[PDB]
Amino acid sequence: LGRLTEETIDIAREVLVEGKSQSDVARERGLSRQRVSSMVKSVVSAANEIPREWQRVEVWLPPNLAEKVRQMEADAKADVARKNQLTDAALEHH
Amino acid sequence: LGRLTEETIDIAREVLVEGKSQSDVARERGLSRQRVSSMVKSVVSAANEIPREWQRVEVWLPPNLAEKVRQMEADAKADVARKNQLTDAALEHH
C-alpha cells in the first residue's frame, strides 16, 4: 500500500479480501499463473516494511537458543530503519 | 506412538484423524479443556523424536542469516541421538 500500479492493487485485493483461489483469477483476466503469484507477493512484503529478498523460516529448538533467534530478527529490523533515513538526508543538499 | 496409556491414544486419535474440535470431545468424555490439550501435545512431540520442553519459532530475515538458523536445528537434533545411546550402554554392566 504505497507506490504501485493500479492493476497490482486490483488483482491482489480480490484474493486476500473475499477469498478466491489464484487459479480461477488467471483465466478471467487472461494472465499466466507465474505472474499473478508475483503480484500478491509484493503487497504482503510492503505491509511488513521489509525488502523483497528476505525469506521465511520455521523450526523446533531448545529454550535458550529459542530466545537468541527471537532477538536476531528484532535488531536486524531496526537497522534498515536507521540506515535508510541517513541516505535521504545526504540527497537534500548539505 | 510408543509407551503411553491406552486412553491417551484413543482420545488423541479422534481429533488428528477424522477432524473434530477439541471442545466437543471434552463434554462427551467428561474432561477439562486443559487436559485434552495436554494429551494431544505428547503424541505430536513423540512423532518428531524430541523432548517435550522444546518450543516452535517462526520469523523473517535476510538470506545469509537464514542459512545459519537452518543449521543450528540440524546439529542440535543429532546431538541428542549420540548422547542417548551412550547412557544406555553404561547401564548394561561393563
Numbering used by the authors:
A (entry chain A), B (entry chain A): 13 to 106
The authors write:
ArdK is a 102 amino acid protein encoded by the broad host range conjugative plasmid R388. In R388, ArdK represses the expression of five genes by its binding to their respective promoters (PardC, Porf7, Pssb, Porf12 and Porf14). The KorA family of transcriptional regulators includes plasmid-borne repressors involved in plasmid stability and conjugation. Our structural analyses show that ArdK, a member of this family, can form a symmetric dimer similar to that observed for KorA, yet it binds direct sequence repeats as a non-symmetric dimer.
